[PDB]
Structure 1
Amino acid sequence: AEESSKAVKYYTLEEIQKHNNSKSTWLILHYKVYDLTKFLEEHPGGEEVLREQAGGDATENFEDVGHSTDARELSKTFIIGELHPDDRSKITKPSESIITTIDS
């Protein structure tokens, strides 16, 4: 009648957590929110690879897998929003420090 709205722009860890279905594959990369549902098809690992990560900040993982500057840039095509102040500094800014010392 007289209104409009779209583009998540800013979502909460929960909002993204709710979206973890092949239909609502939402995840957070680096600190933004991307629509995996739009990047489902694509990806070598498959659609799940994204779904299995959809439902929160996948960066924490996507960082280990060590994606390519292309994969990251490509995600910019799915970017629908970003993590709000509800869990920004909670995920925002990637980082990981683990000691690797195995043998098997």
Structure 2
Amino acid sequence: SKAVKYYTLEEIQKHNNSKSTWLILHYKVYDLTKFLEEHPGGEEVLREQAGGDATENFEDVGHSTDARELSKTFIIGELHPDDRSKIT
């Protein structure tokens, strides 16, 4: 169970609500569904970014090393290589 899992942006855009909230950070895909109520910055800022890239939003508000480590709980795979050029 160690092989990479790729998701297309097309698929990621469908996961946009509290039953299944995904987003992308630095080409990695996270399922934050069980994190929404735990996030110190609140649920809304996460819901607003669901189904897309939130890398600049994440980096712009100075997330700590502790935040970066914690994000590993929610990683489900990587952005498909063919979609990485869409993330600007």
Q: TM-score, normalised by structure 2?
A: 0.83
1:44 matched to 2:74: no
Q: Whole-Å Cα distance in 1 between the matches of residues 83 and 74 of structure 2? A: 20
Question: Relative contact order: is structure 1 or structure 2 higher (C-alpha 8 Å, sep ≥ 6)?
Answer: 2
Q: Whole-Å Cα distance in 2 between the matches of residues 17 and 39 of structure 1? A: 18
Larger proportion of helix: 2
Any idea what the Cα deviations from partners look like across 1:19-47, whole Å, max 9, x if unmatched? 11111100011110001112112112222
Secondary structure in 2 aligned to 1:8?
coil
Larger radius of gyration: 1
Q: Is the 8 A contact 1:29 1:58 kept in 2?
A: yes
Secondary structure in 2 aligned to 1:26?
strand
Segments of 5+ residues of structure 2 without an aligned counterpart are: none
* Root-mean-square deviation (Å): 3.9
Q: Whole-Å Cα distance in 1 between the matches of residues 10 and 40 of structure 2? A: 27
Larger proportion of strand: 2
Alignment of 1:1-104 (within 5 A): 9-91=5-87
